[PDB]
């Protein structure tokens, strides 16, 4: 049987930093000097509370704003609600999550589980346009009790005309072995719509990207249109039914793929070989 | 228990007008001199029939065309099918709705229930490009027997680079009290794709925007990409799990929010106060 | 009762050609001299294997690449994986499909069933930008055991600013009789997002476009946003609840419909008449 998420409800603490990078970009990190674009993955269980002690090490105001999770207005990360952070400053954001359940009126409250993201809200403009452009974005995953955990999680961010703020035609590339349970968090940012596509693999267009059984009528797809701040996620079995290979993923907007929005899902045999590579 | 829609099947009558407004815009209304942009909400139950006695008070041809509901070709609102209205003229459009049910061949006929809209089809071009641009659009809601009625319904229309044809950074703003059941009808028009986003709230990407219980695998989202003539809708509990606050909604295409596609969901305590506002 | 797909598992063989057309376009066909834009429909049952003996009759390199179905890397149709075809050359692509089922780890493997497409991957650019632009695309349908077969299937491809590579305002138009079970395969290609819309009809936004019964919470729609390489499909009962008529379909992006992305769903009485036509 596959590994599954346990019941949540833990209180968790975390240090996060905003850093200007030597190349001019901006990244979050869990450790000073180890910021990355995209930011590090934050993964919690429904019901967990997360207290992020955030330090802006930059010379400009910056913030943390999250999608999907519960937060009070004092943690929405906006200038308006006095929730950004001054240069050199520290603030504790609090993110909460909740489980689904029946309300008193008989309705069904949705849980927090899903594929989400965090990003800056005040660099460049009051909507973080400069922050996002420079790399201040990262993924968040909230797990429901009992759903399936992967062998590894990769984050693919279409940010304007870049993948993960990389130069055209520089990946990123990811590697797996035939049979691995691979998870993708797919996030879009900036100005343009895109269509995300994988060669040789497909997934369900629902909450987890996975069907639990035969009753789910969700479309099975390998192409999906996305816009700025959209986030979705899915799991695949690397090479399932198709074998080892250098499997392209790309934006399928023709000029975008032509201009470098391309990468490789490198699925290897156990000996490491990739047919045709 | 929450209030729910009853069984439909009523025959309803309605007067509607198209008016040029003093500012140059065009609006529909239920009363002469009270046209609005967006047009007034039309809400019916599955099975109801609606007879709209429509008068074009403008000096140009205009029409009414609806999405989703049943109508005969004589009510499709097009110049081609001789279904528009001459300046000063009156025409009765008929919209019908039906319930779901089993067909003789064993298949399942879908019902009309959903979040829909009406708009002009002949002002400026044979596709109403001028009518829509000037404000001739409005929302339609069709309820299925037994689904949940809100405390209030707000209509948010992304029309080209405007929200409800308003100037940049002029809202609209909406108000609620922590705990209200708030319904959003979200409609897109014009030339551009958008992504609709709410701070502090989320909904289900299905027909009603709501989960009935734990078996629904629909993604829970707070960001959604939309294109011209898309309509969807949802309900939220104002401030549920997040409290009172000035909660922004906006298009999340960065330049669009920077250029004014922003508004506030003002969720108040009972004393009317909004923390940080 | 309606006709339904049987269990699959047949091994099928097929000849396909790439041809330059006299007008300058490029089309696939099952017979030399009978290429079409879009390419011919390939329809199989889940579990079938398809061996396509493909001949490039053009003076440039070309390929076949499919979405959604199972294929080994040697059939992905890319220059990178040495899977394109030289001018005048022949290659056998193999497409496989599989049924859903329970994995050993308890998870649910999705089946291949869906609305898919094939297109060129090497004409003009390493992403087939020229091939797709010139007309090298076609639809694929994979049926699950037991789902509903239509009276006829039409393919509507939004390719850049054209429908099926046709000149503005030249259709295509399709015809039916009130009561026909009409299937639409809707595919998008090129550079631009679109919104596909039908007058007088609607469908479910799920895998088959159809609801099986009352438990499916999928949104019922008549407008849908699409991007390059998106494919979906649905069935409707021609004129159901609305009668005979010249029912427009179009992209609902206003300038796109104004510029000719329009066609007619001609639904006739048995005597062939169309009210208002
Ligand atoms: Cu925001
Ligand atoms: Cu792109
Ligand atoms: Cu955001
Ligand atoms: Cu129309
Ligand atoms: Cu926008
Ligand atoms: Cu319309
Ligand atoms: Cu490709
Ligand atoms: Cu279009
Ligand atoms: Cu492709």
PDB file of C-alpha atoms in Angstrom, chain B:
ATOM      1  CA  UNK B   1     -30.671  24.412   8.357  1.00  0.00           C
ATOM      2  CA  UNK B   2     -29.862  26.648   5.427  1.00  0.00           C
ATOM      3  CA  UNK B   3     -32.557  27.936   3.096  1.00  0.00           C
ATOM      4  CA  UNK B   4     -32.812  25.961  -0.143  1.00  0.00           C
ATOM      5  CA  UNK B   5     -34.429  26.506  -3.536  1.00  0.00           C
ATOM      6  CA  UNK B   6     -37.931  25.025  -3.955  1.00  0.00           C
ATOM      7  CA  UNK B   7     -39.189  23.078  -6.934  1.00  0.00           C
ATOM      8  CA  UNK B   8     -39.626  25.322  -9.962  1.00  0.00           C
ATOM      9  CA  UNK B   9     -42.193  25.415 -12.740  1.00  0.00           C
ATOM     10  CA  UNK B  10     -43.721  28.894 -12.549  1.00  0.00           C
ATOM     11  CA  UNK B  11     -44.470  31.080 -15.579  1.00  0.00           C
ATOM     12  CA  UNK B  12     -42.979  34.542 -14.913  1.00  0.00           C
ATOM     13  CA  UNK B  13     -43.308  37.896 -16.673  1.00  0.00           C
ATOM     14  CA  UNK B  14     -40.826  40.727 -16.725  1.00  0.00           C
ATOM     15  CA  UNK B  15     -40.294  44.143 -18.321  1.00  0.00           C
ATOM     16  CA  UNK B  16     -36.807  45.027 -19.439  1.00  0.00           C
ATOM     17  CA  UNK B  17     -35.379  48.113 -21.118  1.00  0.00           C
ATOM     18  CA  UNK B  18     -32.225  49.081 -22.962  1.00  0.00           C
ATOM     19  CA  UNK B  19     -31.192  52.678 -22.283  1.00  0.00           C
ATOM     20  CA  UNK B  20     -28.392  54.959 -23.343  1.00  0.00           C
ATOM     21  CA  UNK B  21     -26.963  56.537 -20.220  1.00  0.00           C
ATOM     22  CA  UNK B  22     -25.939  60.155 -19.793  1.00  0.00           C
ATOM     23  CA  UNK B  23     -22.238  59.217 -19.595  1.00  0.00           C
ATOM     24  CA  UNK B  24     -22.417  57.416 -22.959  1.00  0.00           C
ATOM     25  CA  UNK B  25     -22.796  53.872 -21.648  1.00  0.00           C
ATOM     26  CA  UNK B  26     -25.674  51.461 -22.303  1.00  0.00           C
ATOM     27  CA  UNK B  27     -27.565  49.605 -19.585  1.00  0.00           C
ATOM     28  CA  UNK B  28     -30.478  47.272 -19.081  1.00  0.00           C
ATOM     29  CA  UNK B  29     -33.023  47.754 -16.336  1.00  0.00           C
ATOM     30  CA  UNK B  30     -36.341  46.507 -15.061  1.00  0.00           C
ATOM     31  CA  UNK B  31     -37.659  50.091 -14.950  1.00  0.00           C
ATOM     32  CA  UNK B  32     -37.285  52.947 -17.391  1.00  0.00           C
ATOM     33  CA  UNK B  33     -34.789  55.373 -15.903  1.00  0.00           C
ATOM     34  CA  UNK B  34     -33.191  52.790 -13.616  1.00  0.00           C
ATOM     35  CA  UNK B  35     -30.870  50.958 -15.996  1.00  0.00           C
ATOM     36  CA  UNK B  36     -27.622  49.742 -14.438  1.00  0.00           C
ATOM     37  CA  UNK B  37     -24.239  48.330 -15.441  1.00  0.00           C
ATOM     38  CA  UNK B  38     -24.197  45.450 -14.852  1.00  0.00           C
ATOM     39  CA  UNK B  39     -27.867  44.779 -15.589  1.00  0.00           C
ATOM     40  CA  UNK B  40     -30.215  43.600 -12.843  1.00  0.00           C
ATOM     41  CA  UNK B  41     -29.991  40.021 -11.613  1.00  0.00           C
ATOM     42  CA  UNK B  42     -32.524  37.563 -13.053  1.00  0.00           C
ATOM     43  CA  UNK B  43     -32.940  34.569 -10.697  1.00  0.00           C
ATOM     44  CA  UNK B  44     -35.317  31.664 -11.432  1.00  0.00           C
ATOM     45  CA  UNK B  45     -35.901  28.029 -10.459  1.00  0.00           C
ATOM     46  CA  UNK B  46     -35.298  25.092 -12.829  1.00  0.00           C
ATOM     47  CA  UNK B  47     -38.520  24.597 -14.766  1.00  0.00           C
ATOM     48  CA  UNK B  48     -39.627  28.224 -14.621  1.00  0.00           C
ATOM     49  CA  UNK B  49     -40.468  30.000 -17.851  1.00  0.00           C
ATOM     50  CA  UNK B  50     -39.592  33.665 -18.200  1.00  0.00           C
ATOM     51  CA  UNK B  51     -41.332  36.002 -20.675  1.00  0.00           C
ATOM     52  CA  UNK B  52     -39.350  39.233 -20.981  1.00  0.00           C
ATOM     53  CA  UNK B  53     -41.167  42.156 -22.612  1.00  0.00           C
ATOM     54  CA  UNK B  54     -38.127  44.058 -23.833  1.00  0.00           C
ATOM     55  CA  UNK B  55     -38.159  47.644 -25.113  1.00  0.00           C
ATOM     56  CA  UNK B  56     -35.221  49.204 -26.934  1.00  0.00           C
ATOM     57  CA  UNK B  57     -35.332  52.860 -25.916  1.00  0.00           C
ATOM     58  CA  UNK B  58     -32.119  53.637 -27.809  1.00  0.00           C
ATOM     59  CA  UNK B  59     -31.624  55.156 -31.269  1.00  0.00           C
ATOM     60  CA  UNK B  60     -29.716  52.054 -32.498  1.00  0.00           C
ATOM     61  CA  UNK B  61     -30.728  48.413 -32.841  1.00  0.00           C
ATOM     62  CA  UNK B  62     -30.225  46.293 -29.729  1.00  0.00           C
ATOM     63  CA  UNK B  63     -31.107  42.835 -28.455  1.00  0.00           C
ATOM     64  CA  UNK B  64     -31.173  40.410 -25.541  1.00  0.00           C
ATOM     65  CA  UNK B  65     -29.261  37.130 -25.776  1.00  0.00           C
ATOM     66  CA  UNK B  66     -28.909  34.670 -22.899  1.00  0.00           C
ATOM     67  CA  UNK B  67     -26.414  31.921 -22.152  1.00  0.00           C
ATOM     68  CA  UNK B  68     -27.317  28.488 -20.859  1.00  0.00           C
ATOM     69  CA  UNK B  69     -31.123  28.705 -20.647  1.00  0.00           C
ATOM     70  CA  UNK B  70     -33.540  27.178 -23.165  1.00  0.00           C
ATOM     71  CA  UNK B  71     -34.829  29.459 -25.910  1.00  0.00           C
ATOM     72  CA  UNK B  72     -36.190  29.045 -29.392  1.00  0.00           C
ATOM     73  CA  UNK B  73     -34.279  30.527 -32.308  1.00  0.00           C
ATOM     74  CA  UNK B  74     -36.827  33.395 -32.426  1.00  0.00           C
ATOM     75  CA  UNK B  75     -35.388  34.499 -29.049  1.00  0.00           C
ATOM     76  CA  UNK B  76     -31.666  34.069 -29.724  1.00  0.00           C
ATOM     77  CA  UNK B  77     -31.226  37.850 -30.008  1.00  0.00           C
ATOM     78  CA  UNK B  78     -29.306  37.891 -33.303  1.00  0.00           C
ATOM     79  CA  UNK B  79     -29.656  39.988 -36.431  1.00  0.00           C
ATOM     80  CA  UNK B  80     -29.281  36.826 -38.521  1.00  0.00           C
ATOM     81  CA  UNK B  81     -32.387  35.192 -37.032  1.00  0.00           C
ATOM     82  CA  UNK B  82     -34.303  38.482 -37.088  1.00  0.00           C
ATOM     83  CA  UNK B  83     -34.410  38.493 -33.304  1.00  0.00           C
ATOM     84  CA  UNK B  84     -32.999  41.930 -32.459  1.00  0.00           C
ATOM     85  CA  UNK B  85     -35.136  45.013 -31.746  1.00  0.00           C
ATOM     86  CA  UNK B  86     -35.362  48.264 -33.723  1.00  0.00           C
ATOM     87  CA  UNK B  87     -34.909  51.680 -32.081  1.00  0.00           C
ATOM     88  CA  UNK B  88     -37.949  52.396 -29.931  1.00  0.00           C
ATOM     89  CA  UNK B  89     -39.278  48.868 -30.517  1.00  0.00           C
ATOM     90  CA  UNK B  90     -40.638  46.162 -28.218  1.00  0.00           C
ATOM     91  CA  UNK B  91     -40.221  42.395 -28.425  1.00  0.00           C
ATOM     92  CA  UNK B  92     -41.047  39.537 -26.066  1.00  0.00           C
ATOM     93  CA  UNK B  93     -38.137  37.185 -25.557  1.00  0.00           C
ATOM     94  CA  UNK B  94     -38.962  33.832 -23.978  1.00  0.00           C
ATOM     95  CA  UNK B  95     -36.446  31.946 -21.836  1.00  0.00           C
ATOM     96  CA  UNK B  96     -37.277  28.456 -20.613  1.00  0.00           C
ATOM     97  CA  UNK B  97     -35.515  26.218 -18.109  1.00  0.00           C
ATOM     98  CA  UNK B  98     -35.789  22.497 -17.442  1.00  0.00           C
ATOM     99  CA  UNK B  99     -34.942  20.040 -14.637  1.00  0.00           C
ATOM    100  CA  UNK B 100     -32.527  17.105 -14.998  1.00  0.00           C
ATOM    101  CA  UNK B 101     -33.989  13.708 -15.729  1.00  0.00           C
ATOM    102  CA  UNK B 102     -33.574  10.308 -17.306  1.00  0.00           C
ATOM    103  CA  UNK B 103     -34.115  10.166 -21.080  1.00  0.00           C
ATOM    104  CA  UNK B 104     -35.867   7.268 -22.812  1.00  0.00           C
ATOM    105  CA  UNK B 105     -32.480   6.017 -24.121  1.00  0.00           C
ATOM    106  CA  UNK B 106     -31.259   5.744 -20.495  1.00  0.00           C
ATOM    107  CA  UNK B 107     -29.017   8.808 -20.636  1.00  0.00           C
ATOM    108  CA  UNK B 108     -29.163  11.740 -18.221  1.00  0.00           C
ATOM    109  CA  UNK B 109     -30.395  15.072 -19.466  1.00  0.00           C
ATOM    110  CA  UNK B 110     -28.677  17.943 -17.633  1.00  0.00           C
ATOM    111  CA  UNK B 111     -30.809  20.626 -16.052  1.00  0.00           C
ATOM    112  CA  UNK B 112     -30.515  24.360 -16.635  1.00  0.00           C
ATOM    113  CA  UNK B 113     -29.176  25.153 -13.160  1.00  0.00           C
ATOM    114  CA  UNK B 114     -26.095  27.334 -13.105  1.00  0.00           C
ATOM    115  CA  UNK B 115     -24.516  30.768 -13.166  1.00  0.00           C
ATOM    116  CA  UNK B 116     -25.306  32.374 -16.512  1.00  0.00           C
ATOM    117  CA  UNK B 117     -25.580  35.815 -18.108  1.00  0.00           C
ATOM    118  CA  UNK B 118     -27.351  37.857 -20.778  1.00  0.00           C
ATOM    119  CA  UNK B 119     -25.899  40.487 -23.080  1.00  0.00           C
ATOM    120  CA  UNK B 120     -26.501  42.410 -26.288  1.00  0.00           C
ATOM    121  CA  UNK B 121     -25.816  40.836 -29.663  1.00  0.00           C
ATOM    122  CA  UNK B 122     -26.129  43.647 -32.257  1.00  0.00           C
ATOM    123  CA  UNK B 123     -24.756  46.986 -30.966  1.00  0.00           C
ATOM    124  CA  UNK B 124     -21.571  47.953 -32.801  1.00  0.00           C
ATOM    125  CA  UNK B 125     -21.148  44.541 -34.448  1.00  0.00           C
ATOM    126  CA  UNK B 126     -23.230  41.449 -35.160  1.00  0.00           C
ATOM    127  CA  UNK B 127     -21.667  40.051 -31.972  1.00  0.00           C
ATOM    128  CA  UNK B 128     -22.613  42.933 -29.675  1.00  0.00           C
ATOM    129  CA  UNK B 129     -19.001  44.065 -29.237  1.00  0.00           C
ATOM    130  CA  UNK B 130     -20.170  47.647 -28.766  1.00  0.00           C
ATOM    131  CA  UNK B 131     -23.150  46.686 -26.654  1.00  0.00           C
ATOM    132  CA  UNK B 132     -21.009  44.637 -24.268  1.00  0.00           C
ATOM    133  CA  UNK B 133     -18.337  47.330 -24.129  1.00  0.00           C
ATOM    134  CA  UNK B 134     -20.934  49.987 -23.258  1.00  0.00           C
ATOM    135  CA  UNK B 135     -22.430  47.887 -20.435  1.00  0.00           C
ATOM    136  CA  UNK B 136     -25.211  45.716 -21.913  1.00  0.00           C
ATOM    137  CA  UNK B 137     -24.573  42.628 -19.793  1.00  0.00           C
ATOM    138  CA  UNK B 138     -26.165  41.194 -16.689  1.00  0.00           C
ATOM    139  CA  UNK B 139     -26.239  38.007 -14.630  1.00  0.00           C
ATOM    140  CA  UNK B 140     -28.704  35.111 -14.604  1.00  0.00           C
ATOM    141  CA  UNK B 141     -28.959  32.452 -11.886  1.00  0.00           C
ATOM    142  CA  UNK B 142     -30.954  29.227 -12.273  1.00  0.00           C
ATOM    143  CA  UNK B 143     -31.461  27.239  -9.069  1.00  0.00           C
ATOM    144  CA  UNK B 144     -31.920  23.478  -8.745  1.00  0.00           C
ATOM    145  CA  UNK B 145     -34.476  22.221  -6.262  1.00  0.00           C
ATOM    146  CA  UNK B 146     -32.778  22.010  -2.895  1.00  0.00           C
ATOM    147  CA  UNK B 147     -29.577  23.936  -3.305  1.00  0.00           C
ATOM    148  CA  UNK B 148     -28.476  26.624  -0.885  1.00  0.00           C
ATOM    149  CA  UNK B 149     -29.702  30.244  -1.054  1.00  0.00           C
ATOM    150  CA  UNK B 150     -27.358  33.064   0.064  1.00  0.00           C
ATOM    151  CA  UNK B 151     -27.834  36.104   2.260  1.00  0.00           C
ATOM    152  CA  UNK B 152     -26.882  38.333  -0.686  1.00  0.00           C
ATOM    153  CA  UNK B 153     -25.575  38.046  -4.238  1.00  0.00           C
ATOM    154  CA  UNK B 154     -22.902  40.270  -5.736  1.00  0.00           C
ATOM    155  CA  UNK B 155     -22.014  40.413  -9.436  1.00  0.00           C
ATOM    156  CA  UNK B 156     -18.421  40.920 -10.511  1.00  0.00           C
ATOM    157  CA  UNK B 157     -17.856  41.449 -14.237  1.00  0.00           C
ATOM    158  CA  UNK B 158     -14.366  41.695 -15.730  1.00  0.00           C
ATOM    159  CA  UNK B 159     -15.175  43.632 -18.902  1.00  0.00           C
ATOM    160  CA  UNK B 160     -11.997  44.297 -20.895  1.00  0.00           C
ATOM    161  CA  UNK B 161      -9.796  46.211 -18.414  1.00  0.00           C
ATOM    162  CA  UNK B 162     -12.671  47.283 -16.119  1.00  0.00           C
ATOM    163  CA  UNK B 163     -14.638  45.786 -13.258  1.00  0.00           C
ATOM    164  CA  UNK B 164     -18.316  46.522 -13.961  1.00  0.00           C
ATOM    165  CA  UNK B 165     -17.303  49.260 -16.422  1.00  0.00           C
ATOM    166  CA  UNK B 166     -15.844  51.314 -13.559  1.00  0.00           C
ATOM    167  CA  UNK B 167     -12.785  53.534 -13.761  1.00  0.00           C
ATOM    168  CA  UNK B 168      -9.515  51.972 -12.537  1.00  0.00           C
ATOM    169  CA  UNK B 169      -9.208  51.665  -8.755  1.00  0.00           C
ATOM    170  CA  UNK B 170     -12.857  52.575  -8.052  1.00  0.00           C
ATOM    171  CA  UNK B 171     -13.995  49.193  -6.788  1.00  0.00           C
ATOM    172  CA  UNK B 172     -16.668  48.123  -6.663  1.00  0.00           C
ATOM    173  CA  UNK B 173     -16.448  47.341  -2.965  1.00  0.00           C
ATOM    174  CA  UNK B 174     -18.899  44.990  -1.235  1.00  0.00           C
ATOM    175  CA  UNK B 175     -19.694  44.701   2.482  1.00  0.00           C
ATOM    176  CA  UNK B 176     -20.675  41.795   4.720  1.00  0.00           C
ATOM    177  CA  UNK B 177     -20.667  40.781   8.360  1.00  0.00           C
ATOM    178  CA  UNK B 178     -18.554  37.896   9.635  1.00  0.00           C
ATOM    179  CA  UNK B 179     -20.787  34.863   9.121  1.00  0.00           C
ATOM    180  CA  UNK B 180     -22.912  36.071   6.186  1.00  0.00           C
ATOM    181  CA  UNK B 181     -23.504  33.607   3.364  1.00  0.00           C
ATOM    182  CA  UNK B 182     -22.220  35.662   0.411  1.00  0.00           C
ATOM    183  CA  UNK B 183     -22.779  34.634  -3.217  1.00  0.00           C
ATOM    184  CA  UNK B 184     -20.581  35.778  -6.119  1.00  0.00           C
ATOM    185  CA  UNK B 185     -21.598  35.656  -9.780  1.00  0.00           C
ATOM    186  CA  UNK B 186     -18.404  36.157 -11.767  1.00  0.00           C
ATOM    187  CA  UNK B 187     -18.671  37.030 -15.477  1.00  0.00           C
ATOM    188  CA  UNK B 188     -15.969  37.926 -18.032  1.00  0.00           C
ATOM    189  CA  UNK B 189     -16.400  39.913 -21.250  1.00  0.00           C
ATOM    190  CA  UNK B 190     -14.462  41.518 -24.049  1.00  0.00           C
ATOM    191  CA  UNK B 191     -10.981  40.878 -25.387  1.00  0.00           C
ATOM    192  CA  UNK B 192      -8.725  39.607 -22.570  1.00  0.00           C
ATOM    193  CA  UNK B 193      -8.286  36.597 -20.320  1.00  0.00           C
ATOM    194  CA  UNK B 194      -8.151  37.279 -16.563  1.00  0.00           C
ATOM    195  CA  UNK B 195      -7.639  35.424 -13.297  1.00  0.00           C
ATOM    196  CA  UNK B 196     -10.162  36.147 -10.531  1.00  0.00           C
ATOM    197  CA  UNK B 197      -8.791  35.969  -6.966  1.00  0.00           C
ATOM    198  CA  UNK B 198     -10.115  36.567  -3.438  1.00  0.00           C
ATOM    199  CA  UNK B 199      -7.993  37.133  -0.349  1.00  0.00           C
ATOM    200  CA  UNK B 200      -8.987  35.144   2.742  1.00  0.00           C
ATOM    201  CA  UNK B 201     -11.643  32.977   1.051  1.00  0.00           C
ATOM    202  CA  UNK B 202     -11.902  29.977  -1.294  1.00  0.00           C
ATOM    203  CA  UNK B 203     -14.533  27.931  -3.119  1.00  0.00           C
ATOM    204  CA  UNK B 204     -15.073  24.708  -5.080  1.00  0.00           C
ATOM    205  CA  UNK B 205     -14.560  24.618  -8.826  1.00  0.00           C
ATOM    206  CA  UNK B 206     -17.864  22.896  -9.632  1.00  0.00           C
ATOM    207  CA  UNK B 207     -21.400  23.929 -10.617  1.00  0.00           C
ATOM    208  CA  UNK B 208     -22.496  25.629  -7.378  1.00  0.00           C
ATOM    209  CA  UNK B 209     -19.029  26.562  -6.092  1.00  0.00           C
ATOM    210  CA  UNK B 210     -19.885  24.506  -2.990  1.00  0.00           C
ATOM    211  CA  UNK B 211     -19.173  20.932  -1.915  1.00  0.00           C
ATOM    212  CA  UNK B 212     -22.164  18.930  -0.701  1.00  0.00           C
ATOM    213  CA  UNK B 213     -20.001  16.526   1.280  1.00  0.00           C
ATOM    214  CA  UNK B 214     -16.813  14.472   1.371  1.00  0.00           C
ATOM    215  CA  UNK B 215     -17.219  12.609  -1.926  1.00  0.00           C
ATOM    216  CA  UNK B 216     -16.757  15.606  -4.246  1.00  0.00           C
ATOM    217  CA  UNK B 217     -13.196  15.598  -5.678  1.00  0.00           C
ATOM    218  CA  UNK B 218     -13.471  19.116  -7.142  1.00  0.00           C
ATOM    219  CA  UNK B 219     -10.448  21.332  -6.645  1.00  0.00           C
ATOM    220  CA  UNK B 220     -10.766  23.970  -3.931  1.00  0.00           C
ATOM    221  CA  UNK B 221      -9.382  27.238  -5.323  1.00  0.00           C
ATOM    222  CA  UNK B 222      -9.061  30.964  -4.721  1.00  0.00           C
ATOM    223  CA  UNK B 223      -7.713  31.835  -8.211  1.00  0.00           C
ATOM    224  CA  UNK B 224      -9.478  31.045 -11.509  1.00  0.00           C
ATOM    225  CA  UNK B 225      -8.662  31.872 -15.156  1.00  0.00           C
ATOM    226  CA  UNK B 226     -11.531  33.276 -17.237  1.00  0.00           C
ATOM    227  CA  UNK B 227     -12.183  34.409 -20.782  1.00  0.00           C
ATOM    228  CA  UNK B 228     -14.860  36.410 -22.567  1.00  0.00           C
ATOM    229  CA  UNK B 229     -18.418  35.107 -21.847  1.00  0.00           C
ATOM    230  CA  UNK B 230     -17.297  32.714 -19.088  1.00  0.00           C
ATOM    231  CA  UNK B 231     -19.610  32.667 -16.100  1.00  0.00           C
ATOM    232  CA  UNK B 232     -19.234  30.866 -12.781  1.00  0.00           C
ATOM    233  CA  UNK B 233     -20.478  31.406  -9.252  1.00  0.00           C
ATOM    234  CA  UNK B 234     -19.951  30.378  -5.674  1.00  0.00           C
ATOM    235  CA  UNK B 235     -20.858  30.981  -2.051  1.00  0.00           C
ATOM    236  CA  UNK B 236     -18.563  31.710   0.888  1.00  0.00           C
ATOM    237  CA  UNK B 237     -19.037  32.341   4.580  1.00  0.00           C
ATOM    238  CA  UNK B 238     -17.696  35.871   5.055  1.00  0.00           C
ATOM    239  CA  UNK B 239     -14.636  35.776   7.299  1.00  0.00           C
ATOM    240  CA  UNK B 240     -14.988  32.037   8.003  1.00  0.00           C
ATOM    241  CA  UNK B 241     -11.818  30.971   9.763  1.00  0.00           C
ATOM    242  CA  UNK B 242     -10.123  34.287   8.929  1.00  0.00           C
ATOM    243  CA  UNK B 243     -12.127  37.022  10.705  1.00  0.00           C
ATOM    244  CA  UNK B 244     -13.161  40.545   9.817  1.00  0.00           C
ATOM    245  CA  UNK B 245     -11.058  42.495   7.359  1.00  0.00           C
ATOM    246  CA  UNK B 246     -10.670  44.503   4.164  1.00  0.00           C
ATOM    247  CA  UNK B 247     -10.121  41.482   1.915  1.00  0.00           C
ATOM    248  CA  UNK B 248      -8.940  42.348  -1.577  1.00  0.00           C
ATOM    249  CA  UNK B 249     -10.286  40.709  -4.679  1.00  0.00           C
ATOM    250  CA  UNK B 250      -8.614  41.426  -7.997  1.00  0.00           C
ATOM    251  CA  UNK B 251      -7.565  40.109 -11.306  1.00  0.00           C
ATOM    252  CA  UNK B 252      -4.236  38.478 -10.572  1.00  0.00           C
ATOM    253  CA  UNK B 253      -2.690  39.277 -13.955  1.00  0.00           C
ATOM    254  CA  UNK B 254      -0.069  41.577 -12.503  1.00  0.00           C
ATOM    255  CA  UNK B 255      -0.495  44.525 -14.868  1.00  0.00           C
ATOM    256  CA  UNK B 256      -4.297  44.302 -14.571  1.00  0.00           C
ATOM    257  CA  UNK B 257      -4.212  44.599 -10.780  1.00  0.00           C
ATOM    258  CA  UNK B 258      -1.554  47.324 -11.076  1.00  0.00           C
ATOM    259  CA  UNK B 259      -3.848  49.176 -13.497  1.00  0.00           C
ATOM    260  CA  UNK B 260      -6.869  49.116 -11.172  1.00  0.00           C
ATOM    261  CA  UNK B 261      -8.702  45.786 -11.498  1.00  0.00           C
ATOM    262  CA  UNK B 262      -9.024  45.703  -7.700  1.00  0.00           C
ATOM    263  CA  UNK B 263     -11.829  45.869  -5.159  1.00  0.00           C
ATOM    264  CA  UNK B 264     -12.495  45.172  -1.486  1.00  0.00           C
ATOM    265  CA  UNK B 265     -14.594  42.501   0.219  1.00  0.00           C
ATOM    266  CA  UNK B 266     -15.282  44.489   3.399  1.00  0.00           C
ATOM    267  CA  UNK B 267     -16.108  41.941   6.111  1.00  0.00           C
ATOM    268  CA  UNK B 268     -17.159  43.678   9.340  1.00  0.00           C
ATOM    269  CA  UNK B 269     -17.656  42.771  12.976  1.00  0.00           C
ATOM    270  CA  UNK B 270     -21.224  43.382  14.231  1.00  0.00           C
ATOM    271  CA  UNK B 271     -20.131  46.797  15.520  1.00  0.00           C
ATOM    272  CA  UNK B 272     -19.161  47.606  11.924  1.00  0.00           C
ATOM    273  CA  UNK B 273     -15.440  47.792  12.569  1.00  0.00           C
ATOM    274  CA  UNK B 274     -12.894  46.335  10.161  1.00  0.00           C
ATOM    275  CA  UNK B 275      -9.461  45.569  11.659  1.00  0.00           C
ATOM    276  CA  UNK B 276      -6.844  47.686   9.904  1.00  0.00           C
ATOM    277  CA  UNK B 277      -9.421  49.840   8.091  1.00  0.00           C
TER     278      UNK B 277
END
